Paper text:
[name] and [name] act as master regulators of both flagellar motility and biofilm formation, while using different transcription activation mechanisms dependent on the target promoter and the presence or absence of the second messenger cyclic diguanylate (c-di-[name]). [name] belongs to the NtrC subfamily of bacterial enhancer binding proteins (bEBP) and has conserved [name]/FlrA/FlaK/FlgR homologs in Vibrio cholerae, Vibrio parahaemolyticus, Vibrio alginolyticus, Shewanella putrefaciens, and Helicobacter pylori, among others. The protein comprises an N-terminal receiver-like [name] domain (FleQREC) and a C-terminal helix-turn-helix DNA-binding motif (FleQHTH). In between is a central bilobal AAA+ ATPase domain (FleQAAA+) composed of an N-proximal α/β subdomain (SD1) and a C-proximal α-helical SD2 module.
To gain further insights into [name]-dependent [name] regulation, we used single-particle cryo-EM and solved the solution structure of [name]-bound FleQFL in the absence of the second messenger c-di-[name]. We used the FleND48A mutant and included incubation with a nonhydrolysable ATP homolog in the purification procedure (AppCp, also referred to as ACP), to trap [name] in the sandwich dimer state due to binding but not hydrolysis of the nucleotide cofactor. Strikingly, the quaternary structure of the captured state features an overall C2 symmetry with unexpected 4:2 [name]:[name] stoichiometry. The core of the assembly is similar to the recently reported FleQAAA+-[name] crystal structure, in which the nucleotide-bound [name] sandwich dimer is complexed on each side by a FleQAAA+ domain. Interestingly, each of these [name]-bound FleQAAA+ copies are themselves complexed by a second FleQAAA+ protomer in a conformation reminiscent of, but not identical to, the spooned intersubunit contacts observed in the crystal structures of c-di-[name]-free FleQAAA+ and proposed to be essential for catalysis. At each side at the periphery, the receiver domains of the two spooned [name] protomers are found in the essential for [name] function α1-mediated dimerized state, and the 4:2 stoichiometry is further stabilized by trans contacts between the SD2 of the peripheral FleQAAA+ module and α5 from the receiver domain of the [name]-binding one. Finally, despite the C-terminal HTH module being present in the copurified [name] construct, it is not visible in the obtained electron density map. In the c-di-[name]-free [name]-[name] cryo-EM structure, the stabilizing nonhydrolysable ATP homolog AppCp can be found bound only to [name] but not to any of the complexed [name] copies. Within the assembly, [name]-dependent dimerization renders preserving the catalytically competent spooned [name] contacts described above impossible due to a steric crash between the SD1 modules of the peripheral [name] protomers.
Numbering used by the authors:
A (entry chain B), B (entry chain A): 7 to 274
C (entry chain C), D (entry chain F): 163 to 393
E (entry chain E): 163 to 326
Amino acid sequence: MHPVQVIAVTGGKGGVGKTNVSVNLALALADLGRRVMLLDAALGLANVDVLLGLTPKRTLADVIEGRCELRDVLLLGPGGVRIVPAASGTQSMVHLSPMQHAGLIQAFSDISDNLDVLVVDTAAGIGDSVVSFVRAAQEVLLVVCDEPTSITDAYALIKLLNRDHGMTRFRVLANMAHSPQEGRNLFAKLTKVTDRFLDVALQYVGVIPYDESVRKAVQKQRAVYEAFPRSKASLAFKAVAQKVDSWPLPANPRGHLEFFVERLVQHP
Amino acid sequence: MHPVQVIAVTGGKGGVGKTNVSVNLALALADLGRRVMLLDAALGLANVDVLLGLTPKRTLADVIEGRCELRDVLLLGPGGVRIVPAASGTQSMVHLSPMQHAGLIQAFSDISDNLDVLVVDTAAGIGDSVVSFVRAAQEVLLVVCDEPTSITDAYALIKLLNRDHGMTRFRVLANMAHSPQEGRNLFAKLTKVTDRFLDVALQYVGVIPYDESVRKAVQKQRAVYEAFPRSKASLAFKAVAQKVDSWPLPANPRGHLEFFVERLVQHP
Amino acid sequence: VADTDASVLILGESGTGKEVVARNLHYHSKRREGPFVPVNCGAIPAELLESELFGHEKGAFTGAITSRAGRFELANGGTLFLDEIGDMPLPMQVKLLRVLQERTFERVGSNKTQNVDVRIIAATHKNLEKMIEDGTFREDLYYRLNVFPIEMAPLRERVEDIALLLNELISRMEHEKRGSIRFNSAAIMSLCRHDWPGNVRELANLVERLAIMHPYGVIGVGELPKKFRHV
Amino acid sequence: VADTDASVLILGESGTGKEVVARNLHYHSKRREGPFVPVNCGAIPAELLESELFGHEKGAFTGAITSRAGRFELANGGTLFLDEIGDMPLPMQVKLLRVLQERTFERVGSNKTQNVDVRIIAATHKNLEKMIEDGTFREDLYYRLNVFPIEMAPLRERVEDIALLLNELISRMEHEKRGSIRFNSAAIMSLCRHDWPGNVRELANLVERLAIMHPYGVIGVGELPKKFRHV
Amino acid sequence: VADTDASVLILGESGTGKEVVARNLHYHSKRREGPFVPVNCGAIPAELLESELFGHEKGAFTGAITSRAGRFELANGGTLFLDEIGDMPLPMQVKLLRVLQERTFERVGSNKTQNVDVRIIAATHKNLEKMIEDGTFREDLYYRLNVFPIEMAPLRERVEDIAL
Ligand SMILES: Nc1ncnc2c1ncn2[C@@H]1O[C@H](COP(=O)(O)OP(=O)(O)CP(=O)(O)O)[C@@H](O)[C@H]1O
Ligand SMILES: Nc1ncnc2c1ncn2[C@@H]1O[C@H](COP(=O)(O)OP(=O)(O)CP(=O)(O)O)[C@@H](O)[C@H]1O
Ligand SMILES: [Mg+2]
Ligand SMILES: [Mg+2]
């Protein structure tokens, strides 16, 4: 028994590689030796199963519609990572009430085997589902690219969270950067904007290089960590995962709704 | 007085280049000589102003919050295109009721000067706002990339619209393709899936090549059509705009809510 | 019925061509110079139907940002075609009956009464009488709308007309400029041997699909996409 | 009942013509100069029936910008016609019995009692007794109203009356210069063998439809709609 | 009032101790063996006050899986203590006056009238007269209740009692 670390991968801007970061970070953390569960919070449109080549028989639409419980929709994905699949264009998953998000987050407490890693792949945008899944996670990892639109969207998400929920600690990961100096400069620009308007704490995690092996892996419907384990992107993901494993574990519950409050209450 | 053509740029998958296609298509259609209005349907996160380098004093958040009407938020963008700006992380625009979308669509009828082009850049995903803005448009242009995730997302959007609203006609435009055969093959795959499960009409519009001039334009916060008017992407956009200008104009109103029903009723 | 001012109800199945009948009725009436305003009650959410039909003022609800005219005022001097009247909510049925009876209506969030003279042409594919029997439809509104019923017949019951419909559909594509296509006798016979649910909608959908797929071509038995060949 | 001012309960199926009976009683009694106010308890939404029947004062509810007065006060010195009283909810039934006996009622948002002198002619199409043993209708209200009952029979139980009804309908249609129709013996016999759901409204609607269809001609069995043809 | 069974109205500011006065009247009257049922009108939501005070039968509303009986029948042969009666809405005031005079009331979802013998001790902290000329409280109910008024003074007006 131990507290479970929950990582929300977000960034607001679409097409920045949130799903790739989620999947590859999950496989890398499983490689270091943790029991990892990956949740596809893109509830209306599923991409984790597409990138990993999985064809789930039961998805979360079956859980919400009540045909099955939450345990029997788990899939054993690559590297031992257990996947919670989402629906793809199901009318009962396009938009859910905050009560339904609360119920789904609370129902995850039935799982008591993962080794303090639960990676949550939020959808694009700053909508209600994204905010609900980010606020429920201990760590918030923002994937940003070196474009004005991505910086603006990340700043908007940070400003929303800080203004309306008081969040102040954010992790930033650069993706599709053509040089380490590009990632450093991107972090510098994001921090410049945030310091100019806000008072929040941004921590640089690392950089994932632009690598065409990722594109080949997506075309093959497999993960770049397992399809091309010796590529630059795979090594960057391994380094980031080593950095992520060194993050401090949660110790005290907060007042709002969050994943696995049971383990955060009884253990201390 | 004439009916106004409305073009909804969509595709479900984020980061496929919906905003770039919207802006560049609007600029090219203005180049052919039409009065074009571009609407940023990305209501929670504005990217049209970011890509075009504009800093609007007043946005649609001011319209919905009631400080100003709709005419005075228009901005004269590049090439004479009139831009309707959206908010960037405003708490009153993150999620709007269907009543608010209906009011905003209906309020556009106050504009009676554009030459039958109104381009609507919808948000990522298959959410309520995207569907509302697609259903109100005469033409639905889907931007798809040669990736399993993009094909799946576009198929999900088509399946949603066909199943729950009865649409059967869709335009498909390929983006970031490294060869014309790549665009043809991508269309073949999408039509294969749709034919295997649905009965809908997909029309191939063209292909926009992968061009780094677009990336330079995004970095410069200007449009590839005006910053690099002789690039491959600019020529492709010009060809597509010529193809789009040859589309049949609307002639009869439909029963549901749509842009400019007044012009579709009185003119016939 | 076209030369008189009476409420027409067009009964049939889905995709049987009711809008064409309504437009022909409007064009051969005294209201030829007026507008034709269609309203689909199954393509508008229940909460939006009242605002769409009646209009609203500057502020009437949490989304009204301007004052606009509804489709009754849009149809002033013409005909209002309410398609899929069966899925209209019951309160909206009551309000529509009141408007039809008193000939006056009020915008949502307003207290000014306006008079509009419109011709009502409603369309249905559901068995209304059964709906009154279950109480999901109002009998009084039914008998106000059923002054003259026109019953359309399924394409499976008028199989000998399929070729003429094909030629007519191909004909209109000459005017709306998306191409042209021709058929083979064996293909026509195979199409005639089909069940056709959603009669004219599927016929037009198939013709559009084959025109965009194979432009200026000829359609044989194997040219048809799927489930249209019959031994 | 015509010469007595007493509460009337009219029992009959939907469409039998209870409103005309109420008007005949009202205009030929001591109320002939008083207002006749008809209200349909099924038309007003259940949440607005209170404000509609009793009225309300300023700020009674969200949307009460005016002090609109109810139907009972409009019927003061006249007659109020309650149609399909059976769907009216239980608290409203208790207040109706209070109006009937204690001659008082309360507005919405008001803290005073108002006295009105009205005559209540109630109409319903449901078995009120069966509703009483189902625990849905007030039993005391039923005894208070059923002192002078009028049971209007369905047209299918008085089929030999169809010819006279056709004469009245065609006579009015001729008086208003809307045309005339004539039936032969076969058509009348075929109509007499019909079930008639919605009796008199069905008959009048059919007469209007045939006037539109066959003006100035002889109607036989062949020219009647298929649902009316019988052997 | 102790030896008379009559409706009592206790006037006083919030926190003066009206419940103990009601209990003293109840336990030292002819109701000593009867139940004492206190109800705070301001506590029950306005949409549930009908069901709470009068009860309801099966399927009365969405969520009525049981035929729970109201407070008035629980107070039959005893005393019901209405606290802050001033926020109780007008239709409830009319039905309360009906219970006071006609001794009858109706359940939710029921089509029968029930007779209960209860003693009503009403408590409020608002000027009921000013509410009468504001058109918010029933005037006839006010006369029916204010036949035996108990005015409990604030502690700031009886400061020399603080020691006791
Ligand atoms: N470092 C990198 N190098 C090369 N391609 C990369 C990359 N990171 C991401 N991509 C590409 O980005 C595209 C989208 O990736 P992904 O699906 O993970 O993004 P995303 O999940 O943010 C989109 P959405 O939020 O709309 O679901 C794919 O083509 C992927 O291969
Ligand atoms: N034709 C093209 N060639 C090369 N890169 C392109 C391209 N079109 C788009 N891109 C790249 O994709 C990025 C995203 O483009 P854009 O913002 O228009 O997409 P989008 O509308 O899908 C984002 P969202 O889904 O969040 O609204 C561009 O800034 C650029 O880096
Ligand atoms: Mg994703
Ligand atoms: Mg965009």
